[PDB]
């Protein structure tokens, strides 16, 4: 999270760390959308051109998570996938589309003050909210500055929060040069806007949950996918249309859990 601030105990109880066992480490984050189901970027699980490619066994998942360092002794969680599930029309090849993947928590987690689910949109909500200028908040433990490295300026101690506006679809196609599909959306203030923040390295898979003024709920409007850097006056992150693909999302849940 480029230009953001440190979280607070309980403010995103659905943020999970995609921590591989050994090289004991963290590739990303995801979100709690069931008793036992977690969803994320696909790039976060299957990237060939960098021969990224994991399996249940490969990874282990953690929850209850505030400090990105330690061992959250009795507020944190962890279980390993029972099965990972990607989306059979994903473009790691072209622009990384349908950048979505889900994982049937090998076993089920029981929620608390520190672990609690996120709800998925409905065209209604998918549509009152997914609009130019209406901010959304992105979290994680990702890289405080463009791909570089420092318990400082590299990565945070604790969980990073940023809230960003949606970008007029036109303007979005003119930050990049990548063939952007009606399935991806862009966040982040303008050059001129005079304020900055963004999502960075290992922020990926990390959520784009917004809050619906109708029912005071938190709706995972997005899923972190890409950028051409970190906090460029001139570009906007690109997130996944969690609702466009809400279709699929359903099928695998209702067919394997």
């Amino acid at each position: 999270i480029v230009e953001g601030s440190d979280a607070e105990i309980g403010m995103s109880p659905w943020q999970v760390m995609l921590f591989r066992k050994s090289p004991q480490e963290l590739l990303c984050g995801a979100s709690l959308i069931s008793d036992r189901w977690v969803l994320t970027a696909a790039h976060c699980l299957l990237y060939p051109p960098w021969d990224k490619n994991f399996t249940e066994n490969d990874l282990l998942v953690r929850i209850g998570k505030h400090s990105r360092t330690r061992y959250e002794r009795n507020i944190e969680k962890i279980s390993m996938l029972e099965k990972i599930y990607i989306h059979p029309r994903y473009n790691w090849r072209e622009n990384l589309d349908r950048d979505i993947a889900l994982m049937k928590l090998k076993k089920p987690v029981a929620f608390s003050d520190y672990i609690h689910p996120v709800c998925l949109p409905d065209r209604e909500t998918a549509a009152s909210l997914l609009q130019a200028g209406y901010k959304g908040r992105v979290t994680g433990w990702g890289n405080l500055k463009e791909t570089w490295t420092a318990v400082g300026k590299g990565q945070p101690s604790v969980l990073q929060v940023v809230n960003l506006p949606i970008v007029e679809r036109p303007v979005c196609k003119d930050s990049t040069r990548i063939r952007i599909t009606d399935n991806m959306f862009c966040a982040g203030y303008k050059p001129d806007e005079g304020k900055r923040g963004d999502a960075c390295e290992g922020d990926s898979g990390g959520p784009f949950v917004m809050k619906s003024p109708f029912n005071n709920r938190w709706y995972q409007m997005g899923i972190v996918s890409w950028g051409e850097g970190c906090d460029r006056d001139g570009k906007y992150g690109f997130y996944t249309h969690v609702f466009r693909l809400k279709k699929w999302i359903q099928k695998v849940i209702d067919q394997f859990g």
């Binding site: 607070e8 105990i9 403010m11 109880p13 901010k135 709920r217």
Partner: peptide, 29 residues
């Protein structure tokens, strides 16, 4: 129960950067 953070909503606490969220849907001043 989803979307309802049990350390705020679930007992009407308001996270210090959430109010900033609202003033975009109804645009401040």
């Amino acid at each position: 129960d989803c979307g309802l953070r049990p350390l705020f909503e679930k007992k009407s606490l308001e996270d210090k950067t959430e109010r900033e969220l609202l003033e975009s849907y109804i645009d401040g001043r």
